[PDB]
Structure 1
Amino acid sequence: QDVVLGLYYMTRDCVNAKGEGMVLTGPKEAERLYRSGLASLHARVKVRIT
């Protein structure tokens, strides 16, 4: 119950947030942009995943 709420709030999206439509060189700097305070947890973004 708690963990599906944490995931459903995490992997979602909104039509404008901090860092809308910026491009990221990996998931590591995705978490670094979430922690430093430069993007939001749900902000649509092109990443490069492997």
Structure 2
Amino acid sequence: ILSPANGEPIIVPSQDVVLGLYYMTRDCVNAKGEGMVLTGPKEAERLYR
């Protein structure tokens, strides 16, 4: 999983996975359901689904 020339990982997201992770994790100023407190990540996934 590492490069033979330097200590960097060769398994990297090239174009699509990095775009999906950038679109999923981004900051907005106003959206649906802003200003509410949740109990866990499962409630956030349930509210997204």
TM-score by length of 1: 0.67
2:25 is aligned with 1:34: no
Q: Percent identity?
A: 100
CA distance in 2, matches of 1:29, 1:18: 15
- Give structure 2 stretches of 5+ with no counterpart: 1-14
Q: Hey, which of these two has a bigger chunk of strand by percent?
A: 1
TM superposition outliers: structure 1 runs of 4+ over 4 Å: none
* Cα RMSD, aligned residues only: 0.5
Match of 1:46 in 2: none
Match of 1:10 in 2: 24
* Larger RCO, structures 1/2 (Cα 8 Å, 6+ apart): 1
Larger radius of gyration: 2
Task: Report the 3-state secondary structure (helix = DSSP H, G, I; strand = E; otherwise coil) of the residue aligned with 1:25.
Answer: coil
The number of equivalent residue pairs is 35
- Give structure 1 stretches of 5+ with no counterpart: 36-50
